[PDB]
Write a protein that binds this ligand. Structure first.
Ligand SMILES: NC(=O)C1=CN([C@@H]2O[C@H](COP(=O)(O)OP(=O)(O)OC[C@H]3O[C@@H](n4cnc5c(N)ncnc54)[C@H](O)[C@@H]3O)[C@@H](O)[C@H]2O)C=CC1
Ligand SMILES: NC(=O)C1=CN([C@@H]2O[C@H](COP(=O)(O)OP(=O)(O)OC[C@H]3O[C@@H](n4cnc5c(N)ncnc54)[C@H](O)[C@@H]3O)[C@@H](O)[C@H]2O)C=CC1
Ligand SMILES: NC(=O)C1=CN([C@@H]2O[C@H](COP(=O)(O)OP(=O)(O)OC[C@H]3O[C@@H](n4cnc5c(N)ncnc54)[C@H](O)[C@@H]3O)[C@@H](O)[C@H]2O)C=CC1
Ligand SMILES: NC(=O)C1=CN([C@@H]2O[C@H](COP(=O)(O)OP(=O)(O)OC[C@H]3O[C@@H](n4cnc5c(N)ncnc54)[C@H](O)[C@@H]3O)[C@@H](O)[C@H]2O)C=CC1
Ligand SMILES: O=C(O)c1cccc(C(=O)O)n1
Ligand SMILES: O=C(O)c1cccc(C(=O)O)n1
Ligand SMILES: O=C(O)c1cccc(C(=O)O)n1
Ligand SMILES: O=C(O)c1cccc(C(=O)O)n1
Ligand SMILES: [Cl-]
Ligand SMILES: [Cl-]
Ligand SMILES: [Cl-]
Ligand SMILES: [Cl-]
Ligand code: NA
Ligand code: NA
Ligand code: NA
Ligand code: NA
Lengths: 245, 245, 245, 245
């Protein structure tokens, strides 16, 4: 089988991924690394494709190694930005047969949410995102919410900004500004991963909400990317381009 | 201006519609009828197009009159079914220049909801609709929710039904069966018009929710249908075909 | 330690309970039974207290055995009714030192929900319950929702029923009637255990919502009942009487 | 009848209040002032009690005049803080027969929410507030949400703060800090007034949500305060002390 390594194998999501890869008939687990394991275990193990669920502070280093070594990468780790994507692209120039796919959410409901928010955005005066996650999460706002806001922003190019009469305010009250879209981050015990996109116009609102109750919700999207990763050399952002929508 | 009558002119929505028509520059109010006003006021007033927000028990009678008299109709009244649509179509055979558009929801957020539910349906194991409305509403479930469920059902043709292990149950607990989609109707003081489409699969859910807080949310969709009604001779169901999506 | 048996040890909740009991310092696991294990394993093992998470069809039989044998019981299995409570009480007449506590929800958020719904009920014209659970659930509506509705009903004794103009309806649309409170049951893949109590009056609504994302949310309530079970001889319904509120 | 003035008589809420006072049998409208009307109209009209729904920038000036002139005040205008309350108290020292009641929310569902959040707070590891309002609102976060967070904070005195691993963050992402409670403010077309208090602990969350769909929801609370205002000389904060809970 296709030889698959996992980075972050002891994390909440990574350990789930290990089980998934092990269990898949067509995939063979070549490596399971967590913090402090050297990356050369991947190359020693003849790994073809790596799944990465680590931490924002280490993921670019992992990618740089993967790409130099011709190893395809399916990355779920967040903390990405346009500059980090440009950087990944620039490393791939040297390794034009290597495929990297980076997605802030592998759960189909979250992918659909982003696609729908994009379609809905131009019909409303106002748009915001609220995201809600467990309180072990390193990054705020979430990768999914940041990507969602950019999509909405892009789709509302040439329309007026959100109306807002706010004239007196506590700092941080109105959330983070992501391309003119307010984005709010709740961190709460009991939660896993959640987001509500909110649109408003006269007398009405539309809410597009996603809930991952279990980290098993990330598995199908990941395995799909792993199995299809070689079709798209270079960088793919998001799961959406592997789907027919 | 285009001569516009309103049926149900004293109702919650109709009275709003009267104000909207009166206020539009390009539209002239030809008649304002409520219960007990004869329909010939419409023809006496040379009405070209009628807006109908009445009651399920009277709307087919109104339509029969409109159609016989060559009067275009934009209908928001609910209580429609496939058989009532066939009937309307059959009356239109005799009056092939008359346009009728019937839509259970004129608010853009609700239209988008239906379009999105249609797109989302095949990705999930489970789908349900919950609708919530003020407690003066004659019909349950709502027209919007019934239409939404049929769309979902249509889109999931050839997939397995919703899983459900329910083996002991109070009657009505699992909602109404609309083409295999459970549909639940809340009737609550304080509400206006609300719906949540819910989809589920392993470890995740997607919720598509619409809220009309004010009956002003129905106005743009109605005025758009009124202004475009003559482009589509015959019967149009829903606002979606007048939109680019 | 206090000797604790579990019935339903292989179920979703029971297996969690086994781990919890095993892990507690002050509790000793005396038995782990699932379907087809004879109940005399409990008495052979000198079990003092049993935790029950089985099925509505078997729980009364289990209770009858526990009570005859003087074994205290902390029951989470649902499907209970006033008649089943009377029956349990009637068996306890013969064994007046035996304590039984039966609770449809051991999660603190659900307990609080019930207490709050009770306090809120008399301020509103309208009340409904919607509950949403995984699609392996045998019973609809849920035990928590049924108990919640009775509490609300009790608290609204002598007030008018929910207003409702519904004059045309699909069967089951308006939910199950629990003491005049509409109760609706969603069964959806991705879910665990969820409920929203809804109250309405002029221009406003109040929603009290609980989500158990993980079955670990039932553990503290159970262990608390297990450790305190002997303080209340006879039958206790709900976790609320063990709490200060 | 009791002579009642309204400040902010042309605003969204004030105009509703004017209608309510006019319509009440036991209340006589003595004045209707909006921006630019001199306050001496109140004293010329022999006003006994004033209802204030104006703007944060003017309300303290209005109160100073009311209090100097011995006129009781029922204030819904937000923008209040502990220092503004101390100030109001200090003015009342000189006029010890004058009653002032200041409440950030007059709708019963919002009052109940605050009372419930207070009761719930000590059972959870985490608490946040999200508030959502129309985009004409001057202040963020809302008065109701700020008061709610202080109540929660007070109730969690001596417990650990909300857990949060956030190590990389966009500014404003985590909301405003109100006594250690994250508070987030959505401003969206279509909205009126909305709030969700969120509590979390292991595997579970509790959400207490309020929606005012219409400004009529503020009327009963206001009229109740107006009719009872003389019972409590001095300053009352909130509607809760006029209710039995
Ligand atoms: N794209 C998606 O669908 C999803 C993305 N995420 C994102 O994935 C990342 C991880 O999430 P969780 O599993 O919750 O975090 P986690 O903290 O549970 O696990 C991360 C694991 O990575 C390990 N690690 C740290 N440095 C490493 C290194 N240099 N090499 C190998 N392993 C290393 C850690 O020791 C830890 O075991 C986060 O950035 C999160 O936002 C999380 C869930 C779904
Ligand atoms: N498509 C959409 O966007 C929407 C549809 N609706 C639907 O529209 C209908 C009316 O809703 P509301 O305005 O809430 O009801 P409503 O009860 O407030 O008003 C209906 C009005 O129709 C009048 N009426 C009854 N029989 C009549 C007749 N034979 N001719 C003329 N007028 C007559 C009534 O006296 C009343 O004033 C309902 O079926 C409702 O479900 C409501 C809101 C939006
Ligand atoms: N009170 C509370 O907080 C909660 C109550 N529940 C209720 O608890 C019950 C079980 O829930 P789940 O664990 O989801 O169901 P489940 O189906 O996962 O597990 C039930 C287990 O009981 C076993 N069982 C059946 N008959 C038995 C017998 N005669 N003796 C011993 N074991 C037997 C089954 O084989 C199965 O392994 C349900 O009635 C559910 O509604 C569930 C979660 C929380
Ligand atoms: N406590 C509660 O239940 C509620 C409180 N509010 C709060 O009440 C206030 C007003 O809310 P809205 O009615 O939405 O605002 P609004 O902007 O619709 O109306 C405020 C009115 O006050 C007038 N005004 C301004 N300065 C004035 C002055 N010096 N004297 C007399 N009138 C003056 C304005 O011209 C305007 O017509 C806000 O601070 C809002 O947050 C709003 C709703 C409910
Ligand atoms: O968009 C994100 O950052 C995201 C998505 C799903 C899960 C998580 C997580 O658990 O951190 N984070
Ligand atoms: O789909 C429906 O039936 C519907 C939609 C919007 C408003 C109403 C209503 O107020 O009755 N009904
Ligand atoms: O009230 C109930 O019936 C209930 C409560 C929590 C979990 C479950 C379940 O998983 O079935 N059922
Ligand atoms: O707490 C608040 O600030 C509040 C409460 C209700 C309505 C409004 C408003 O419309 O501004 N503001
Ligand atoms: Cl995507
Ligand atoms: Cl449509
Ligand atoms: Cl309880
Ligand atoms: Cl209060
Ligand atoms: Na494998
Ligand atoms: Na006009
Ligand atoms: Na133990
Ligand atoms: Na009056």
């Amino acid at each position: 089988g296709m030889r698959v390594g996992v980075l972050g194998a002891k994390g909440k999501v990574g350990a789930t991924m290990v089980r998934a890869v092990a269990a898949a008939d067509d995939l063979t687990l070549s490596a399971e690394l967590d913090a402090g394991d050297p990356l050369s275990l991947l190359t020693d193990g003849n790994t073809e494709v790596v799944i990465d669920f680590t931490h924002p502070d280490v993921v670019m280093g992992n990618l740089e190694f993967l790409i130099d070594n011709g190893i395809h990468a399916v990355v779920g780790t967040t903390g990405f930005t346009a500059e980090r994507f440009q950087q990944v692209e620039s490393w791939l120039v040297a390794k034009p047969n290597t495929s990297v796919l980076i997605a802030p959410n592998f759960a189909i409901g979250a992918v659909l949410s982003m696609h729908f928010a994009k379609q809905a955005a131009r019909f409303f005066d106002s748009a915001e995102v609220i995201e809600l996650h467990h309180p072990h999460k390193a990054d705020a706002p979430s990768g999914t919410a940041a990507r969602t806001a950019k999509l909405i922003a892009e789709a509302r190019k040439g329309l007026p900004p959100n109306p807002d009469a706010t004239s007196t305010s506590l700092p941080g009250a109105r959330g983070a500004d992501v391309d003119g879209i307010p984005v709010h981050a709740v961190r709460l015990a009991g939660l896993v991963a959640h987001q509500e996109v909110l649109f408003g116009t006269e007398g009405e609102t539309l809410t597009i909400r996603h809930d991952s109750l279990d980290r098993t919700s990330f598995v199908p999207g990941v395995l799909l990317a792993v199995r299809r990763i070689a079709e798209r050399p270079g960088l793919t952002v998001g799961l959406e381009p592997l789907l027919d929508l």
